[PDB]
From a paper:
However, the GLIC is a pH-gated channel, activated by lowering the pH, with a maximal activation at pH 4 and a pH50 around 5.
In the apical region, the residues either face the solvent (D13, E14, D55, E67, E69, D97), are located at the subunit interface (D49, E75, D136), or are located at the middle of the ECD β-sandwich (E104). The mutants D49N, E75A, D97N, D136N, and D136A display small increases in pH50, but do not meet the criterion for a significant effect. A structural analysis was performed on E26Q, E26A, E35Q, E35A, E67A, E75A, E82Q, E82A, D86A, D88N, D88A, H127N, E181A, and H277Q mutants, by solving their structure at pH 4. There are no significant differences, measured as 5-fold over Wt, seen in the backbone Cα residues of any of the resolved structures, with the exception of E35A and E82Q. Additionally, the prediction identified E35, E75, and E243 as gain-of-function locations if mutated, whereas E75 and E243, when mutated, have either no effect or the opposite effect.
Numbering used by the authors:
A (entry chain E), B (entry chain A), C (entry chain B), D (entry chain C), E (entry chain D): 5 to 315
The structure:
């Protein structure tokens, strides 16, 4: 079966629509998401036109094999989508209404800069390759773009699912290609990061600062070194949930900066002990008293600077 | 093959039934479960009606290809179900009895608010889309809804498997969809959480309180910081078995609250040492004696408040 | 193609056999095992009778599509088995000898009560559903039940592979169903648990008891708290190799009980320090001396009681 | 299509060959390896004989469906191999030269006794099942056994890939079976185990022996208990890379033995403290001085005994 | 269908091209990467030649089944590629233009010597096998070799994707093979290794050197042993992201060398205590003062030597 011939030299418009049934498995490390959706395609094929008065029938149903169907592919999928043709309906003028239900694993890059207070625009790119006989162009039927009310993505809030109505028409290997951009806007639910990572991380940090109200070097060494080890555990935990980025993430910056606080607390604990052993506890007392204010003040100002730079 | 034509303008009723053979892999992080079951479908097709006397047969067996079969899909499935047609039997009046055995990975959301003492209602949503020629509506044959007595779900107790007999009829892309809700009620076997997480977590916490019967700052720092690190290990362990939720879970709240107890125990240990170094051990003795009562009492009252709020 | 017709009203006997080629992946958490085996089926189909003089062949070979083959399924599989038809041989009377090689992931519940000194009876349930025309019943050809001498299951000893010769015939959705029970008896190789979990766990426990020969509170706190943390690591390790059970496992009980020993050792260490600080070391000396005997004696008696209760 | 008929009562010889293209994924825990290779089969079928000067062609190419091909299977595969028929060439005398490219996951047992200084013999067992018309026997065409020079197996050295030319002919379910043993000899690259596990493990052990040059019980307890915990971490790490064995492996024995050294170091540290508290430091000094030598000596002697027993 | 016959005895040239659409999953441990691309093939088949004037058409479209297509395979793939034929266009002279979109998991070795500052040359080896009728040779159409500008490989920078235009011609299984080398040059984004592994690792190391400004053996033991344990955690973390190599990696060498620094710091801490207990603190003071300079100087020089040897 060949493509429909043009009336004049016009390209063949394939109107498209995606209706999300299910959203699942947003993998941060992989930068992938799985989707289960309806893909709708519509185009005119005058060769299929019929008289509804004569035929008695208002609509003609077809098997995919029986007619020409545009080969629509997804640009950003891991493997080709698993599709099930739901319906193919032809109206008297030859307008074909194709509907399939598919499942696909989509590769869409994520920006982790503001993690875990980040928002993402996930993409589903539809594409058609033109033939020698005629140029095929994609379009968006907005009446056929949407999502089921029950669509949920664990650990995320779904903001909107829209399509950039204007396709990207470009040449690729001496044939036209017509690409469409379906955008699924999501924002991470940061809630659980507060009681599970952020506040536990701050508690252990504040515990290390109790060494500024202690003259016991042995206890101080234990306080600062022990809490530093728990910070390393949190750093390891955080970096397991994320891919390696050529930029600093928000949490990454805080986590990194906190190492400097532990390092300076050790220097302080060391300086205090050395002075007290050298029979200079008055000087050690001044440094320890200043530290009590300096450490929380510098921590709060540093966080204000970071929050400003990232948001 | 076209759908059965209506006698009058009535929709076609497809009676359904699901009989669970196997239940497995309830994944909490994924919020999925795997099922292996019988799907039964029944509808009247008068074009298939026959005279038992002339034919000799009192039931006719068919191959799926030979006749029209309604395209039934599951809404909440990762990938389309793996089905195997077991039987298709037609009675003289044209009533078709279709049976298939399927396996599917079902996506059903879980409420972790009362974890690990939670109960869930897992869903299997059956759907059918109408055709241009006629509207298809779903029904429940209760005689064909059930589960094998041996059906077990590791870590869970199976309470019931029932169906909401009235479908949720709605329009989707200008065609009627008829959706049925099959509900599998389960309750989590919380038993193992008691010897493996809850009691070890309480033991380490109570160990931190032995610092209220010690004047040794160095030993106290060791007691409270060491047990805090073991609590972080339990928090990490717990959060690996669960997805990130935009709400507090029962265990999550207890785990979080216990951090405040460790924090205040460190403040106490610090205050006691500072006072004793300042030659004020009488005042330190009063704070330590009060702590011995205050810590267990406040812990027990806080847990009563939490248990009340969650149950 | 219809099933073979009866000579009289007798059901159709399908003789079965399973010959294990490979056993692998016994997953404790999943309660599954993977099997690669021969499935042999035999039944009479008089419609397939032939004269070897005419046909010029004593046995006829067929493609599965060419003839009626009973639809044999496995009850307890995750997904439908991967099968490859090896041979189909028809002798002149119409006796069909079907042979397939399959691989399947079998769901079979495990009893961890005596873990890791436990034994299991793994099951492979064969089933057939009757048709309108005639009742199909399963049987066991014992000459065709067995296992390759080289069949090994990593971490287990294979005791026997037998079949319960009498099928379970029962009605399911108004049709007879014929079930067969193939039983693979295995027993766990508990060896590696001794040098990797049990003995390391006892060594750290005995190390904590050296605190009963020390008057150094700071050293004692370190001894008991440090070894308790290593016990938590072993508990976490053990529970990762097992599913969450609504009962106590043997190892689980020992692991749990050992927490009580660590808890009481902390109480002792605390009591000893409090007394020595209160200038009562004579009383502390009595408690410490008693502990030296009490702790190992109570540990040994408690283990005798547990071993008795579990075996 | 039936098998080739015999000239006399001789069995049909199927000459075989395996040429490895890729080797990957040697999974120690699973005791599996993945292979991508050429499988070559050759046999005479006189029914396919032709006159080259009358047919014009010197060699005839066929589609698998067109001719009888022996059903060759692999004994030790997880799931049936993924095969792609590359070529089928028939020479004038009726000699068929079949070539396929396959990929398979091979289940082959491993001997961890000398790990990580172990060598293995991986197996790929080829098998054919005879038919009623004639017995099929396997043979090895050595000219068609080999491996690509670039074949690498990460973490292993590939020594040789040979075939035991004599097949194992045996009856199985009243038909002859002809098995062939293809052997892939490999030896593990132990190198990385030295800087990552062995030397770090020895460093921490030698660190624990610095307690033999210290009279500080509190410091000694810290030295020995801390390093013991790091040894537990290495033991856990090692046992994650290996399956559970009903025998001791080399690393396992060393790892186990080192626990006894930590245990005795604790006894020593305890004995030294008890004596010094009892005002017997002269006796404690003798035990500590003896320990300084006895420990490394016994350690190094015990290692010689182990190396001897294992190699 | 047979291959195209030669005009004279010339081989059949199959011009090839690969256009990368997506690059993903560079697995370091597996030494694999997943690719989604266009594979273009072109060859002359005079049997397909047509007169454009009498045919009406300037080009002819074909279904793969209708014509002879060269069987092109990939050498270094795990499983055979998943392909979807996009277009087959025949020009009047019989020149066939074949286009398929494929996805494959390519096995390509990585050199981790300079890790994580390493660069790789990933390979895709295209191959075709000759037939008895004629020799098939591969060529590169450079106009059809490329990559989409949006092609990203998480954690890597893509430098170039080129082809070695001259094929490798060798005999394998008594037929000539024509192999092409497609090279994807990448360089690892080392950025995240600095804040997550390298700097944390240096901070803990420098913390252990504060023991050179302390006379407290108990505190020193804590400082050096605690930080050593955190170094073991980083070593374990690093080795989980990498396969076992028969060579030292850059990070591996640094990580290994740092163990020697911890070992010598323990010797120093021990020597200092022994001397001070023996009433020789003046000598201990000299060793501690020298260590303060020696340790950072030797660390910096050792790193200069290592950086030189590796880069
Ligand atoms: C009488 C002193 C009360 C101290 C209360 C401390 C509250 C800390 C609030 C943290 C909020 C998040 C923050 C880290 C420092 C903790 C304070 C150290 C104890 C001071 C002891 C001095 C004895 C007179
Ligand atoms: C007055 C001393 C200031 C301390 C400055 C420390 C600089 C550290 C720079 C790190 C750069 C990366 C190297 C780790 C040792 C740190 C110094 C120990 C404290 C010195 C105490 C002396 C008390 C008088
Ligand atoms: C240590 C410091 C703790 C981290 C502080 C939170 C970061 C933050 O302030 O995050 C900010 C984000 C919201 O930012 P947004 O609306 O998504 O960005 C868009 C805004 N623009 C366009 C103006 C740039 O979350 C919150 O509202 C934070 C609430 C949780 C506080 C957790 C306290 C513990
Ligand atoms: C510190 C924390 C202490 C332990 C918290 C236990 C919470 C609890 O006992 O929770 C209660 C749940 C019951 O679950 P439910 O069926 O949903 O109750 C529904 C009730 N309504 C409908 C009125 C809301 O468990 C149990 O009764 C089992 C006993 C738990 C033993 C814990 C031992 C430690
Ligand atoms: C003679 C004192 C006996 C102490 C018994 C302690 C029982 C603890 C019960 C826990 C129940 C769950 C609970 C944490 C505090 C433990 C008690 C601290 C020891 C007191 C030493 C005083 C020395 C006279
Ligand atoms: C601390 C506690 C250490 C655990 C003690 C072993 C448990 C046990 O005695 O386990 C028993 C199992 C055998 O079980 P069985 O005889 O086959 O069961 C049959 C039970 N009847 C009689 C009820 C039917 O192990 C043995 O034969 C002993 C080897 C293990 C010794 C490990 C020493 C460390
Ligand atoms: C003057 C003493 C120099 C000590 C050098 C130690 C080298 C150890 C070589 C290990 C090789 C791997 C081996 C564990 C013991 C380490 C030695 C303890 C320090 C001795 C302090 C005595 C002070 C006089
Ligand atoms: C003279 C001291 C000999 C100590 C021998 C210890 C044998 C332990 C056997 C364990 C078998 C499994 C078992 C835990 C306690 C260990 C003993 C504590 C040391 C005693 C110091 C007394 C100094 C006089
Ligand atoms: C502490 C224990 C350290 C381990 C010592 C190596 C064990 C060994 O001796 O391993 C031996 C294997 C070689 O094995 P093979 O020659 O193939 O055995 C076959 C020989 N037969 C047939 C005679 C039995 O490795 C080596 O050559 C050791 C080199 C690395 C040493 C790492 C030291 C750190
Ligand atoms: C502890 C010491 C820390 C490690 C030092 C960085 C290693 C290095 O110097 O790495 C060098 C590589 C670049 O080398 P290249 O250009 O890819 O090799 C090709 C060069 N030839 C051809 C001449 C051999 O990274 C860098 O320039 C990154 C700088 C990061 C510094 C991190 C500081 C912490
Ligand atoms: Cl697609
Ligand atoms: Cl479905
Ligand atoms: Cl509606
Ligand atoms: Cl409708
Ligand atoms: Cl099955
Ligand atoms: Cl196979
Ligand atoms: Cl391929
Ligand atoms: Na079509
Ligand atoms: Na149908
Ligand atoms: Na300590
Ligand atoms: Na059949
Ligand atoms: Na064949
Ligand atoms: Na072809």
């Amino acid at each position: 079966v060949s493509p429909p011939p043009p009336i004049a030299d016009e390209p063949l418009t394939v109107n498209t629509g995606i209706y999300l049934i299910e959203c699942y498995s947003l993998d941060d490390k992989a930068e992938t998401f799985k989707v289960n959706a309806f893909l709708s395609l519509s185009w005119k094929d005058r060769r299929l036109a019929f008289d509804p008065v004569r035929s008695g029938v208002r609509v003609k149903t077809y098997e995919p094999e029986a007619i020409w169907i545009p080969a629509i592919r997804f640009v950003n999928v891991e493997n080709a989508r698993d599709a099930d043709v739901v319906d193919i309906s032809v109206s008297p003028d030859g307008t074909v209404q194709y509907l399939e239900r598919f499942s696909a694993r989509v590769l869409s890059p994520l920006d982790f800069r503001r993690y875990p207070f980040d928002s993402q625009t996930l993409h589903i790119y539809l594409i058609v390759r033109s033939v020698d006989t005629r140029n095929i162009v994609l379009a968006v039927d907005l009446e056929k773009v949407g999502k089921n009310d029950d669509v949920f993505l664990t650990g995320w809030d779904i903001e909107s699912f829209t399509a950039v109505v204007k396709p990207a028409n470009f040449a690729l290997e001496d044939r036209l290609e017509s690409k469409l951009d379906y955008q699924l806007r999501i924002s991470r639910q940061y809630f659980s990061y507060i009681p599970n990572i952020i506040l536990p991380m701050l508690f252990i940090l504040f515990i290390s600062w109790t060494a500024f109200w202690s003259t016991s070097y042995e206890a101080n060494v234990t306080l600062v070194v022990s809490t530093l080890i728990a910070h390393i555990a949190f750093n390891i935990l955080v970096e397991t949930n994320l891919p390696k980025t050529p930029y600093m993430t928000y949490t990454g910056a805080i986590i990194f900066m906190i190492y400097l606080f532990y390092f300076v607390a050790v220097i302080e604990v060391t300086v205090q002990h050395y002075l007290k052993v050298e029979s200079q506890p008055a000087r050690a007392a001044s440094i320890t008293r200043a530290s009590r204010i300096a450490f929380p003040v510098v921590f709060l100002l540093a966080n204000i600077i970071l929050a400003f730079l990232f948001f």
